[PDB]
Amino acid sequence: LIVNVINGPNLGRLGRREPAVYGGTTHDELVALIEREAAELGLKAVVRQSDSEAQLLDWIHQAADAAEPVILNAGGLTHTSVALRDACAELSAPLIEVHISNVHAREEFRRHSYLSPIATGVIVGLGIQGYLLALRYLAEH
Amino acid sequence: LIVNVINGPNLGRLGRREPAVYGGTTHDELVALIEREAAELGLKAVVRQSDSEAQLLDWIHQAADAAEPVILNAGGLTHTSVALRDACAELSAPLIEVHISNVHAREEFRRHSYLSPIATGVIVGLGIQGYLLALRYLAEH
Amino acid sequence: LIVNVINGPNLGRLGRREPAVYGGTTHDELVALIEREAAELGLKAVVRQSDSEAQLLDWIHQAADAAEPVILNAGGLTHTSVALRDACAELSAPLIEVHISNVHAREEFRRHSYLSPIATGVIVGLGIQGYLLALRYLAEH
Amino acid sequence: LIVNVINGPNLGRLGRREPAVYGGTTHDELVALIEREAAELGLKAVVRQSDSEAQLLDWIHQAADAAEPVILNAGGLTHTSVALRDACAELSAPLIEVHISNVHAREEFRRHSYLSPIATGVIVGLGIQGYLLALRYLAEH
Amino acid sequence: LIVNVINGPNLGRLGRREPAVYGGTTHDELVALIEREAAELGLKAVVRQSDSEAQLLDWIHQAADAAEPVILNAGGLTHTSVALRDACAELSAPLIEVHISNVHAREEFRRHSYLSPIATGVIVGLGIQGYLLALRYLAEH
Amino acid sequence: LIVNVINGPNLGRLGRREPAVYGGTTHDELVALIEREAAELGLKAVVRQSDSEAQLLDWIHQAADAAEPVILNAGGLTHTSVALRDACAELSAPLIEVHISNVHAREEFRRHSYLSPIATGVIVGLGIQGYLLALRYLAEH
Amino acid sequence: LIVNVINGPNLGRLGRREPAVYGGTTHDELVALIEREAAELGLKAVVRQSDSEAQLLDWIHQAADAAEPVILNAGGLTHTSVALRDACAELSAPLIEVHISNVHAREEFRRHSYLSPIATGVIVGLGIQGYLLALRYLAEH
Amino acid sequence: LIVNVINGPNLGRLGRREPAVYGGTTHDELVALIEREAAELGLKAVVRQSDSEAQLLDWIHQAADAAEPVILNAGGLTHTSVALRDACAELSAPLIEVHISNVHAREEFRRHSYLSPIATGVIVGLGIQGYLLALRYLAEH
Amino acid sequence: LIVNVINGPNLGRLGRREPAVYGGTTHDELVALIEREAAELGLKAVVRQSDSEAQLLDWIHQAADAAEPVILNAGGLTHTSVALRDACAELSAPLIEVHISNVHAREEFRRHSYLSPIATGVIVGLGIQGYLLALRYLAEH
Amino acid sequence: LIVNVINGPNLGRLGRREPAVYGGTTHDELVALIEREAAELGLKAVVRQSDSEAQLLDWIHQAADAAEPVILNAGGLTHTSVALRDACAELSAPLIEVHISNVHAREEFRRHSYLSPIATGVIVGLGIQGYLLALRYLAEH
Amino acid sequence: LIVNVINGPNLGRLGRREPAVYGGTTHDELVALIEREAAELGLKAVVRQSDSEAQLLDWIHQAADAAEPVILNAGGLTHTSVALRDACAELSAPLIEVHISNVHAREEFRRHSYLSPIATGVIVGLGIQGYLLALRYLAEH
Amino acid sequence: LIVNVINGPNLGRLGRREPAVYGGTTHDELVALIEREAAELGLKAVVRQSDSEAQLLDWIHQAADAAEPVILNAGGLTHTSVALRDACAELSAPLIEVHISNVHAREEFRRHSYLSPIATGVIVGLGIQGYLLALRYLAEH
């Protein structure tokens, strides 16, 4: 049983340079945390990241064809992309929206999300652990 | 530590209506799962519901005093009450807002929350499990 | 059959202050008028008023359980309470929204109603007689 | 002892189409149903329908001129016409706005009425019986 | 079968603007062009124009009753009339909204339309040919 | 040297109600005052009234054709009719929006005009005399 | 009987750049024009211009003290100054708002006036002749 | 000469957290401070607080029945409660709304008050003293 | 201690007009009443009024150099001036906003103030005693 | 000769998911279909699809360079890309905006398009035939 | 060639408070620097500052008669004055808008400018040197 | 010092069309100009362009890692991309925003920037030379 964890724009740079606001864990450390929780829960996590929206669409397309669940942090594209939402509307397995930071306590534009109205649910502001809590939801389907 | 699980108005009527949106689990059955799960997490859950504001604020006053964390599902009051936001403002230990349903997939009015801005984080649309996923978060702050 | 007539905040003060707007009948005389009209229609009208939200939710709960009709005039809460709206969402029998003043003739905030969209119907500004017309609609289903 | 009942655009076609919205009754069937109830109340009821605004304003002037109460379902014009409002603001006797369907639970544009702030009162969503209920209000004024 | 082409207020005046917007063909030319083209697709086109909404409702009501397709250019009514839309909604064959100008390059008020949501489709900005294309669409039912 | 004075809906009933806002002059009196004034300015006025949009459409269409100027008091169609604006937009000769009451000092809805932006100029709040002040402007031009 | 005619900021510089929009007439010429015209109406116009809001309010104070009428073209202040509105609100004789150009067919912001709800009437888009028309209104009271 | 000092939700906890924005003073210190000034000014001060909208409404009812004036700091309910407002509207002696914090310097939502438009006057951001400054006002009616 | 009392545009007219709104006290009498109270509270009050924004700024700059407190009634400029706002933001000593009238019971636009979010606090609607209440607060810093 | 057909995000997966909207033809089959119709019109269609914004931009550049007309269905990019619109504005030959679904009959955000204001025309909701009607318009203009 | 540098309100207090974004130079030294660079650029720069709106518009008038160009930091009046905006619209020579601080990273109300839409361009956030870079643009014409 | 000059989508087409809202110069020439100018300043300019959001993010990433400043003209992305802004918030050297045309004199949507709130400063409407003024500022640090 495969779960896709896809991260969009700028999340390769986690831990790097600044914040504070996202944690000091790096993308590589997070990939490794996700795989460890995955195994504990008896699932295979496939974790990916890109700064390219097209690449992101391809990734969601394969999840849709594979009937596979998706934990998604679209990053910036969350509040901006209809193309990405239109792709997610094709998933028939669950979709969990994830935000590292509590997006409801920041700039007002971070409060809109094309993803929320079609996701199974959303997790916001629980640190990197949010990913791990999502996985565990998926583990109970 | 102790953790207070506070349920807002109507939530006493759980799983008698619209099993599709709010679950088939009754309120008692919920007290059950949360308590057990908190035991497994090595915490002690105190799980209470009320149809009344004063009551709610009072319970939140106590958690403040005790410097204990709160999982809050405030029901309809999530969307209307500054009194409750202000009581939750006192808390020095983490606050986690929960909603069984995906509020972003429903009436527009349900997408404004007074708590999201001052909560540590927010779990929406993952059903009943959302309470337990809040617990696991708290188990390591 | 039983027909609940539920009056929300301040409506107990019915009679003192500003007739013209909400007419010269006291609350006690209103109860009398209602039960009378109901009797001549074939119904038993239980008539109740409360300044307390929790109280009003409880009575809706009871009506919901019992599957009886409800005629509601929530006063202030019409414009502000989501908790109350949801409690009425439980009801499987008709729910008539009633206001004595024409709320469309007055301040802007009185023109918004959280109950209107889930009501079977709405009667506004036809004085205390607005209640009696609701009874009559119910007598014929 | 005369009451006027005026239906606007499209109400010629009382279904014809649809169900829980609008009648299963026809316009003729309504005219006669009104006159029955009217007669029963000791009132001559004058029921008229037009798809012409111009023609509706003219009926309204005559009611204005004779100081007779008016029951008005302006259909689409409710939400749109200032001219129809201006004509009605001339009525010295009572004006009751009736909508068959519950307009507050439909598209957003239906939730506005140029008539409501100047009507005596407003009945919404009680079906065809809403005309009859407006008749006995006037029976008492 | 038969196609109804319906033209609203001011469309009689086609040919007194010149220039961009509406073009130099006139309404008589238009009926001839539409009639030739249609019988060349093997349909018969009944093309009608009126400055009066009540007249336009009537002709819709007819199509509703006879179950014919309507190609509609509502002129200024497009932006203002709940009445027209409600009439159009009754139609059971295709309904195609047509605008000669690009209503999207013009005044903001012209950007809005009560017809679009309930139509099969909308052709805009393609000049006169727009009518002819909508016929061709109708040629494949 | 013809001037067209066109009076939209409800203006046929001037005189009786609200003489402190529209004057206590009837329409028949307004006709005489205008004619007598255009006479003395050496113009000929044609003063027409109608409650029908289609009828007004026609009268505007006619001045468009005769290149004759229009003083228009569209009454309630001022705030609602694009069809009306679009017909006036065809005039080559001057067009003057007239309003007897100070619309800016009244309901919010009365403050928007579809005519002002395409008009030569606009007179508001100067009573019946605003009609005659518009004649004087056109005489000087 | 003295009429006051106050011109706000930039109007000192009429004549140079435009018309249409503003005059080809200079402020000096306009003073003479008004003066000649008032004289053959039986009025003495006093005509003043100033870029200083202080200066302008002092003049409005003078006419409030003398109970004299005021024709006002306030320039940019028309859309911005509460201080100018409030000075004018003290006036017991009429106040006519005059704009040379049609403020309704230019930038959105020019369509809003702090002065209009408190004027007797407004005259817009009749060029300089707007001044003389206003005096004529005053001649009749 | 009795003056009622009524405090709303959470205000019982004054002085224990964020002492920089609300009192450094406790609720008891505040009752002491007020009765001292009440006495000093020749009044009686009755100071009650509550977390319950219903209890508060009850007290406004009492003052209203006794034509005693009210100083209200409704806290959270200031922004949310139409109920509370409607009860206050009933008072015949002065209503002075008080806030300890400067509500105009904080979250946007704190800048709406249902009480303000019905109050005699409002004191804000002057600390605990504001109550005492309100008393002196009442001592002069 | 010097306390500066600054009154803005149109304040030179207090007590000739709207005596229910702003009171029957003249500005001279207001000066003498403020000064008097100043002595009672052991301070000097320098009270000045100007219709001129520049003059008002120059005064506020001076209070800032001198590091003296300000009780400001800016009249009109309260809702419109960023210049004034920016001058008051330089005050190192307290700043109290005073309005005579209750600005929240009046026009919509009298609810906005550039001052309030930078004032120490605000007193509204308490009539002339409002300046004196501000004085007393200042007598404790 | 050369007409360009460009399809945006996700339209590679055409025919596959919601046939009732979108249709049952795959992309490959659309290409064939459009090349066929173009040949009968004496045209040559080049039909291209791509999830990448920059790729789509590159293609628009090429037709601008080549003065070729463009028929563009951008999917999600329709409502979000200024970049795409700006590319399209460079074009000198006609631009035709096509949407297979009626975009006015779904979520609100699908009702805004950055392309419509700069397009020659727009066809929406006429299924896959929209591409073909767009071709024929181009063959005639 | 001559160049006009015009500082509006509060700008005579440069260098007092604070650091950013104003930041450190007094207006005296500011004048000295500008004239320096200007000479180096081989220009003649006249640097004037005023708190008076009226005074400001005077200088703008002079510059327009001279056909000199203008660097303008209007301070508060950028956000509020249509008068200032209208006087700048007669400059035949270029008009550069300068802000010392970044208006976009500050309060919402600082983000609107009556000036921007009619300026040649706009320099923001680059501190005191922004004046300096604006000279350079003018240097190159 | 290295300074990165980053151009967004379509800027490759610079100077080829709509000269000069943007173009006289081409993109190649601009690189020439930026470089010569930079060298004369003792700076090294690296100038780069892309129509790809991801490709622009990547170059922003390289500037953050190298603590080099960025001059950015983001094209259409300026108004729409949160990914780009979030990437620019990592930067530790100055970020200057540059637009060739006056964005505030054009379509309403171009008056919005995700980049401005976080940029050191913004230069708009000074044509190509704005890049050169941004170089000069940086040379000052």
Ligand SMILES: O=C(c1ccccc1)c1cccc(C2=C[C@@](O)(C(=O)O)C[C@@H](O)[C@@H]2O)c1
């Ligand atoms: O803004 C940065 C940044 C981080 C470190 C240093 C400098 C800037 C950044 C990077 C990646 C993702 C995200 C983002 C991540 C989120 O999706 C999240 O909270 O998980 C919220 C979303 O709105 C935002 O674009 C932000």
Ligand SMILES: O=C(c1ccccc1)c1cccc(C2=C[C@@](O)(C(=O)O)C[C@@H](O)[C@@H]2O)c1
């Ligand atoms: O509206 C009902 C209802 C219940 C049973 C049958 C029919 C309606 C209801 C009841 C309790 C809580 C809640 C609510 C619970 C939520 O907090 C949630 O999804 O957990 C979302 C919140 O918006 C809502 O008031 C809703």
Ligand SMILES: O=C(c1ccccc1)c1cccc(C2=C[C@@](O)(C(=O)O)C[C@@H](O)[C@@H]2O)c1
């Ligand atoms: O506001 C008063 C009041 C009483 C006495 C004197 C002055 C005002 C009051 C009291 C009870 C119910 C209600 C109300 C009742 C209504 O539901 C109604 O019309 O029945 C309309 C609703 O908007 C309002 O809150 C108002």
Ligand SMILES: O=C(c1ccccc1)c1cccc(C2=C[C@@](O)(C(=O)O)C[C@@H](O)[C@@H]2O)c1
């Ligand atoms: O939509 C139709 C229709 C129904 C069957 C056949 C053809 C059209 C229709 C007709 C008359 C009135 C009305 C309408 C009537 C209402 O005034 C009403 O509820 O009575 C609400 C109002 O918003 C709507 O325009 C609708």
Ligand SMILES: O=C(c1ccccc1)c1cccc(C2=C[C@@](O)(C(=O)O)C[C@@H](O)[C@@H]2O)c1
């Ligand atoms: O404004 C005129 C006019 C006519 C003849 C000469 C000069 C102007 C006019 C006439 C008919 C329809 C229309 C109109 C036609 C449209 O339906 C259309 O684009 O076909 C769009 C709509 O917004 C407008 O009312 C305009």
Ligand SMILES: O=C(c1ccccc1)c1cccc(C2=C[C@@](O)(C(=O)O)C[C@@H](O)[C@@H]2O)c1
């Ligand atoms: O609303 C009435 C009415 C008349 C008498 C008694 C009661 C109401 C009415 C009648 C004719 C024209 C008008 C109107 C007249 C105006 O055009 C005008 O002031 O001339 C302003 C316009 O907004 C309104 O439709 C109103």
Ligand SMILES: O=C(c1ccccc1)c1cccc(C2=C[C@@](O)(C(=O)O)C[C@@H](O)[C@@H]2O)c1
């Ligand atoms: O903006 C200019 C200008 C003049 C010549 C060349 C370029 C600009 C200007 C000057 C005087 C008065 C006025 C003004 C005068 C008006 O009051 C008017 O139309 O009378 C309308 C009002 O919105 C505007 O501020 C504008």
Ligand SMILES: O=C(c1ccccc1)c1cccc(C2=C[C@@](O)(C(=O)O)C[C@@H](O)[C@@H]2O)c1
């Ligand atoms: O939010 C708190 C709090 C207390 C302690 C620690 C942290 C927050 C709180 C408590 C009582 C009243 C109030 C409030 C009281 C106010 O009425 C006031 O300033 O007096 C303004 C109003 O907007 C707010 O709800 C706030």
Ligand SMILES: O=C(c1ccccc1)c1cccc(C2=C[C@@](O)(C(=O)O)C[C@@H](O)[C@@H]2O)c1
């Ligand atoms: O409009 C007059 C007036 C004066 C004397 C007689 C009649 C009217 C006026 C004068 C000074 C201040 C103010 C004003 C005073 C306020 O500052 C206030 O309520 O004190 C509110 C503010 O919005 C308004 O501009 C009004």
Ligand SMILES: O=C(c1ccccc1)c1cccc(C2=C[C@@](O)(C(=O)O)C[C@@H](O)[C@@H]2O)c1
């Ligand atoms: O949203 C989906 C989807 C389809 C089936 C199943 C799940 C999602 C999707 C896919 C491709 C294009 C398009 C779209 C295509 C349209 O351009 C169109 O109607 O052609 C309208 C436009 O707003 C939308 O983005 C949507």
Ligand SMILES: O=C(c1ccccc1)c1cccc(C2=C[C@@](O)(C(=O)O)C[C@@H](O)[C@@H]2O)c1
């Ligand atoms: O607000 C002050 C101040 C000075 C000291 C202490 C506190 C505030 C101030 C002074 C001069 C100009 C300016 C201003 C000038 C600006 O144009 C600018 O950035 O140059 C931005 C503009 O919005 C603001 O009004 C502000």
Ligand SMILES: O=C(c1ccccc1)c1cccc(C2=C[C@@](O)(C(=O)O)C[C@@H](O)[C@@H]2O)c1
């Ligand atoms: O629209 C075109 C175009 C290109 C070539 C020929 C004709 C038009 C275009 C191209 C590049 C950048 C830009 C743009 C450039 C700006 O960033 C700018 O002025 O620097 C303003 C911004 O809003 C717009 O996206 C526009």
